[PDB]
Amino acid sequence: ADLYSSPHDQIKEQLRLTIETIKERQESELINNPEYGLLASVTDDQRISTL
Amino acid sequence: QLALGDHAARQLANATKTAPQLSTITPRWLTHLLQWIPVEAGIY
């Protein structure tokens, strides 16, 4: 962090990439979370199958 | 004893205390003589 930070800040770059990964994980959780996910939340009356 | 002694009298007195002295300190002439150049990102 001290030595290799011009023209780019190393800590900020690492934080940005990690936050991107975290946001992708959040998108995954919104769908596949076992207790609050959409797929778990749908009801049997609202579930249908292809013909 | 005619009067109060120096050993007893010092208990009311504040000593002058120096910062600790370090024997290994040297003038370090070479650092003063050299010319120092800044590097942008640790590479030269």
Side-chain angles (χ1 to χ4, degrees):
Chain A
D2 290 332
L3 292 187
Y4 309 118
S5 294
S6 169
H8 298 118
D9 182 294
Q10 302 278 342
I11 293 166
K12 285 186 179 355
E13 266 314 312
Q14 296 273 306
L15 281 166
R16 173 182 76 86
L17 299 165
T18 310
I19 284 155
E20 292 296 336
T21 313
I22 284 169
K23 286 179 185 197
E24 303 284 338
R25 179 67 169 260
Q26 162 186 60
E27 192 201 11
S28 193
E29 283 324 292
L30 290 173
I31 299 153
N32 311 281
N33 180 277
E35 74 173 22
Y36 297 122
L38 291 164
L39 292 176
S41 308
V42 72
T43 75
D44 286 77
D45 170 64
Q46 296 287 286
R47 304 187 63 120
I48 57 165
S49 196
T50 50
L51 304 149
Chain B
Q1 185 171 339
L2 312 173
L4 171 81
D6 314 71
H7 186 216
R10 177 271 232 270
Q11 301 303 318
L12 305 189
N14 281 345
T16 288
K17 301 164 254 288
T18 81
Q21 313 289 299
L22 188 52
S23 60
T24 68
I25 295 174
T26 72
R28 302 187 303 260
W29 297 120
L30 174 63
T31 307
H32 298 289
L33 291 162
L34 269 164
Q35 164 177 45
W36 291 92
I37 302 302
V39 295
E40 185 183 35
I43 307 149
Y44 193 73

